[PDB]
Design a protein around this ligand. Sequence first.
Ligand SMILES: Nc1nc2c(ncn2[C@@H]2O[C@H](COP(=O)(O)OP(=O)(O)O)[C@@H](O)[C@H]2O)c(=O)[nH]1
Length: 335
Amino acid sequence: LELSPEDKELLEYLQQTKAKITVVGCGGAGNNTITRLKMEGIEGAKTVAINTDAQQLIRTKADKKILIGKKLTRGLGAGGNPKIGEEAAKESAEEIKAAIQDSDMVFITCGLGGGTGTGSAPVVAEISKKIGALTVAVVTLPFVMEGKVRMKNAMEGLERLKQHTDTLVVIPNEKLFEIVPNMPLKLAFKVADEVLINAVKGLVELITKDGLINVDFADVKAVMNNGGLAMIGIGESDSEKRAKEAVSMALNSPLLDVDIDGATGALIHVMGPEDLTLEEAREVVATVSSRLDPNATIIWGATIDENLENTVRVLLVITGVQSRIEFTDTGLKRK
Ligand SMILES: Nc1nc2c(ncn2[C@@H]2O[C@H](COP(=O)(O)OP(=O)(O)O)[C@@H](O)[C@H]2O)c(=O)[nH]1
């Protein structure tokens, strides 16, 4: 490429706004998330799948696969015991470290409540912190119908994650039943899949994807470095006032299971068809800004999704909500 000294300096500036990003999916649900991200083609991110279960791991699609606890469970799994998942991850700590080495940002994703995910996720998070990466977890809490043991295990895992994350994005699966009431559990998991994909892919591609408005990693780091506890809101609309309806739906999302007045920061990803305008994106941001505390630090981007024909989708990630939430054995309680 023919490049002038001025063009080179411009390219150098744009390069330092980028980040090396790795997404790590732990356990059954985490592996399923990774497969979907790999097939759909998540932009600018390395995908790593880890599991104690060799049957689940081998059918997963990923850039890198790690069978954890080879000398512990021999590829059998963890049988829903978080202690087994934790010990397996600790055994394979060096292999996990090698796979995420030199990442500027690491996403850790799983369904909390099981053995492998609940156990290994905090270990991956600890390893990520120790390599100096911006460490973000995007995790689900189980449905109520899964039982008390699953939720108790999940909440203990959430407490361990909190010790080793910069931002902890929590998605309560139970609130999906407000979006799709009385859905069969097996199909409700498929909805949970889509939400996890939207959350992880949406956060990653806010930084990595070509957009109308691209985001500097420095600005993401400024919000997410001490993001604490975070929750998401998703909205979509294809009407005449698509942007207004999408942001309204996002702000009123059941997944935002918190008083949003306690928020100290926010990430906004506006997604639309080829006809998406800056004016539409600005309308979304202005609506969020007016609703939140005036002192909240808001970072936003806008990208074109080719799969969308007439629909604008808004992903909202609200940070610093730990002051309005209490961690209990039965789940998240509003304070
Ligand atoms: N999105 C999604 N979540 C799931 C699925 N299966 C289970 N989960 C959730 O993830 C939690 C842990 O399940 P799983 O990943 O299979 O356990 P693990 O392999 O031992 O970590 C469960 O308590 C469920 O709430 C699935 O197919 N999709």
